[PDB]
Symmetry: C3
């Protein structure tokens, strides 16, 4: 009977067993004498290997998936009803992401543990990288060294510049139409290969996460503050999800559609419960189809377009979670983030929540993308993974609720056009 | 009646209005107190963004346009005659570029404002870059540090190494014939995407150039010396164009063809006037067709090949202009150029005059390619653009004259072969 | 009668004449006064150009040949009999490689002329490069700077990380099947282009090698130690070949097949002699086919598969030679190699003995790949080429013997399957 439960989710059960084993081994080694830091380095080495493996692939993913999605997936044959959905998604997700950054900088869960103008000028300068091979590992930083300001070259990937340039590249390829089909197919092949590599690497994730946990449990001064930091991080994420799902999305539905959002929740309550249970938008998709069709009575076309694409492109709770987690790792490491990196994380949270289900088994890769877009030490992911089992259900329910409200909004903004088409 | 003039050339009129607005705003701010240099940095920021965009695009252009041109365009179905044109172009253009580099180093318009052996060895070393990913942003510089000479890695793109390697790459691809079509098409698609990006960016050029002008007017010591420097630069370009069009090209026609070049000039006078009026070789191409066909009576085939390809590959006046302008920017900044960078600019001027009309709206990109091949500060282009409205007509006229003399030379070097073919 | 000998091998005779001319000119200049080191730098400059050319081409070769071989060449239509061969090759070659590294570090031909744990951890870190554009020119090195260990970015190509990533990439390409054809063809075309470039550059090899030889002869202290160093290096290579082809391969045949290996030698004696005479596995291939078929009586299928692919993938003597030569250059320069670079050279020798005949005229490129994978000065190759005319015959003989024993081993490990197939 146990096999029928564990085997069907072998990767998840392996990761859970690895986390438990790493935590208990870390506790046992903590019960021992203060360990030689080289022995800790050997212990936490497979985690370093996993982090390096994933950070090796964070580059080809942003090179290829942006091009493939912008060129290939974006088809305007859906007409205005398509755009009314798309402009919704990239609008609500940011509202989520910024909200997280507002909350985590207000609560500062881990905090107890250059001017802003130059920071924003540096943000804009790194957003247009004057070189493209040097934007793969180097950003430009303004240094006042002591009144003549200059621009030196930092070390760290320039995620924003590459993302901007390849968004432009994908848009141009899409505008070429069919004459660029050869390169569209080439980059689609590269994307499939890189996703195969990500899946292949993530099978090694159990042992890497186990070693990361066993290397972080040993090297903390006292658990009495780390446990409180993690608890406040959970509190921040849950408060953000509540504020987004229960106050912001109903406010959008009220201001745009001007229909009672509480009736909408009464309709999609079954979908929300099924999203909490399944913890997957794709699995919950039939339930939300049934709810929005037979309960709210919205048009079949608007649902049939919005829901299948909103379940993979519109995830709000994941964006808020990733923003809060990146800022929490920044604060817990003592790294205070300026106004040029807060916007960087608040944009990479969006651009990594877009691809957190469009690319299977890429949550860790997206978290590392966010943590390396702001130059942070990417070794504290272990604390996130040790707790990223209760938040997943809530942040999936928030995504499903966001998709439902997107379907409602798009239907209410295109009812006249659909009626006119159906009349003929 | 005004829209019939401004509307047709919307980009040109936008750039002119931007330049005028930037100049008048700079004058007004100059009438104010010495401004905080940070306020100047904010003022001159959109120009910085434009230069960063263009310098971002200078890499894929030399990666892809060289491949597309050498592999795709070069087809020897034209036979010996085709070579008799090509070896002409890449010769006379150089005769232009070097000439400019001489004149600007004899007049030194902006000057008042390591041994050469090691410099040439450094030129040859950077011509064969031992690494290709490190040649995208780093050149090798010889340092005597104090008798044991060594080689360190400077900062700045290695334009010569990339150009040489990809000339070899394109030549090999062309020698593969049809078996390499699947990558010829890939690089052609990439070239079209990059050209679309250049056009898209150059629509932002008005605001960037306006801000560059308004940030350069404020931050100069006195307008007198700058105006004199610009006047001397324009005089140098005029002298170079006169010496090339009126003395060098007739000398080539005399030494090779041994026919009176003044009769040729009398014949192509109409084409020269129409080139001055139109300021475009492509628009003057029908006029030079008619002139060279019904006035000089050269063969139809030699004209039909040379002129359509010479109007886009053979521009000598543009090469002389670009060499003189790059050296003038070097002299204004006080950057004295050694014998390893003078050859660099005198080669990049040729390789940019080749692609200054094969790629629409890529003149600024070519100027930045030349200014970054020799490690110069790319912020003085505004001074060039302030005066680059009277030199355009004259350099276009010189290009058209060069194409006409190339047609004459090629016809006189293939009359026997054409006669033998026509006899059968 | 002389042209019938020199003309057929024009590249080989050109290289020999260049070596002789460079050596005699170096001797004559040695008879002169101590020369200005700048004159020596000028003399040894074409050799520097050749080294830079080849080191420029070592990157696209490992980018493209790995993909082309792992994806394209590896076809499992040969069934298990294929794997029984392949697992043999990559296991014999390593034995050939490591053995060389054992002898050269034991004999240290040129020697008279960070802990190991951190070295191996640095090996593993450089084998998983956290960045893929920074892995093209930079490795990570552990520095104890003075108890808090850190990781700083060294300078030098990260050959191992790129090889590992692109082995993974090619394996994924091959596993994804026929949907990757549009990119397999792209990389095959790129590989053929780069092979054409390697052949084109290697035609310039005579003059570069002559200048390298002259520059080395001019700039060494005394021949009394250099001649002894080269003699000991040749003795080490010969000892390694004798041990591998006389003690190790017969031991493998005895332990696996349990048949008298001396009878196997008696069977392939003609093949061994023809391999020594021809100094080429491909030319000897008909002779070893005839010997193994009509003398040992092994199955036609096993021979017809193993020999044609073993002649181009299984060269053991070349791996031993390259490992010994790289370590000999390391010792002769006074560069002591740690345990993290000994494994690097012992793996790059294996991965460059595969591509030492799969890519014609790429022996120098493979030697430079090995010498730059361990951060060595690539100017001592001339002293290898001065003696690399007697060792070629012996290493070719060892390669042919290895292929013959591979055929024997694979036949004895698949006799039952072949008999069962033939019975039906
Ligand atoms: C901070 C929050 C609580 C209030 C502010 C949120 C607004 C900035 C965003 C959230 C949802 C967005 C709406 C999502 C959908 C649309 C449809 C879209 O209009 C169209 O698609 C027209 C059709 C077409 O583009 O062709 C843009 C306006 C609007 C109302 C957006 C307006 C801006 C909105 C209200
Ligand atoms: C500094 C200037 C004023 C005088 C020196 C200029 C010469 C170095 C260049 C200028 C034009 C060149 C000529 C342009 C055209 C040709 C045809 C070309 O010959 C062929 O094309 C033969 C056919 C073939 O290549 O198959 C090369 C020689 C020649 C006379 C070139 C010889 C070298 C010339 C005279
Ligand atoms: C240091 C040397 C002198 C002794 C140790 C050498 C062994 C480590 C290597 C050398 C040759 C290798 C053998 C080469 C061929 C094979 C066949 C191969 O088995 C198969 O191919 C099964 C079919 C399949 O793979 O599906 C792996 C075992 C074996 C005996 C290898 C076992 C390991 C061997 C003996
Ligand atoms: N599940 C929903 C939305 C969704 O994808 N949630 C999600 C996101 C990332 C992820 O990976 C991570 C990320 C971490 F930051 C971490 F610390 C640990 C892991 Br594991 C796993 C799940 C759906 O797709 O419907
Ligand atoms: N016009 C002729 C030849 C031709 O192309 N002329 C040309 C060249 C570059 C250019 O761009 C620039 C370049 C600058 F250095 C600058 F300071 C400002 C600008 Br704008 C504009 C025109 C033809 O093609 O027939
Ligand atoms: N010959 C056999 C095996 C084979 O390839 N041998 C071989 C390998 C490399 C090579 O190139 C080099 C390498 C040097 F280290 C050098 F110093 C000089 C040169 Br040249 C030349 C020959 C076969 O293929 O059957
Ligand atoms: C104090 C806590 C004690 C108990 C610790 C339990 C720790 C359980 C850790 C489970 C991690 C869940 O993360 C999942 O990882 C999967 C694969 O990596 C993804 O497929 C999935 O999407 C994602 O949700
Ligand atoms: C002292 C001076 C006072 C008056 C200032 C007038 C300033 C006018 C400046 C015009 C610039 C012309 O440049 C053109 O740019 C176009 C697009 O960038 C290209 O399409 C074209 O090829 C190229 O010629
Ligand atoms: C003390 C010594 C005095 C006499 C010096 C003689 C020096 C001869 C040097 C021969 C070099 C042989 O190397 C060959 O190079 C070819 C092309 O590079 C490859 O095609 C071939 O594969 C490879 O074997």
């Amino acid at each position: 009977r146990l096999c029928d439960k564990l085997g069907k989710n072998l990767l998840l059960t392996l990761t859970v067993f690895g986390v438990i084993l790493g935590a208990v081994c870390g506790g046992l080694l903590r019960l021992a004498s203060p360990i030689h830091p080289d022995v800790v380095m050997l212990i936490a080495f497979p985690g370093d290997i996993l982090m390096r493996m994933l950070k090796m692939l964070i580059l080809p993913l942003i090179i290829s998936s942006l091009i493939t999605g912008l060129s290939g997936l974006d088809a305007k044959a859906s007409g205005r009803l398509g755009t009314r959905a798309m402009v919704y998604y990239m609008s609500t997700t940011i509202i989520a992401a910024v909200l997280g950054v507002i909350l985590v900088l207000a609560i500062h869960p881990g905090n107890p543990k250059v001017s802003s103008l130059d920071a924003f000028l540096d943000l804009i300068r790194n957003l247009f990288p004057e070189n493209l091979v040097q934007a793969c590992f180097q950003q430009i930083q303004t240094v006042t060294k002591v009144i003549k300001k200059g621009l030196e070259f930092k070390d760290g990937m320039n995620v924003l510049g590459l993302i901007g340039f390849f968004i432009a590249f994908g848009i141009a390829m899409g505008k070429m139409g069919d004459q660029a089909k050869l390169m569209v197919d080439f980059f689609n092949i590269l994307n499939e290969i890189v996703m195969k590599l990500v899946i292949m690497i993530m099978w090694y994730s159990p042992l890497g996460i186990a070693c990361l946990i066993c290397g972080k449990i040993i090297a903390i001064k006292d658990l009495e503050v780390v446990a409180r930091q993690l608890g406040m991080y959970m509190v921040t994420v849950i408060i953000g999800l509540i504020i987004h799902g229960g106050i912001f999305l109903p406010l959008i539905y009220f201001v745009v559609t001007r229909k009672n959002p509480f009736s909408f929740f009464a309709g999609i309550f079954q979908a929300w419960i099924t999203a909490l249970g399944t913890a997957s938008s794709a699995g919950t998709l039939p339930v939300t189809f049934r709810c929005l069709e037979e309960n709210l009575g919205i048009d079949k076309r608007v649902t049939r377009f919005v829901l299948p694409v909103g379940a993979t492109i519109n995830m709000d709770g994941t964006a808020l979670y990733e923003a809060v987690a990146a800022i929490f790792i920044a604060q817990m490491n003592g790294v205070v983030l300026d106004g040029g990196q807060i916007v960087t994380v608040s944009l990479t949270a969006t651009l990594a929540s877009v691809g957190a289900a469009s690319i299977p088994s890429a949550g860790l890769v997206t978290m590392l993308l966010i943590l390396t877009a702001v130059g942070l030490p990417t070794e504290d992911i272990s604390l996130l993974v040790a707790v990223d089992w209760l938040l997943d259900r809530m942040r999936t329910s928030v995504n499903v609720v966001g998709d439902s409200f997107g379907a409602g909004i798009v239907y209410h903004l295109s009812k006249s056009e659909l009626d006119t088409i159906d009349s003929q």
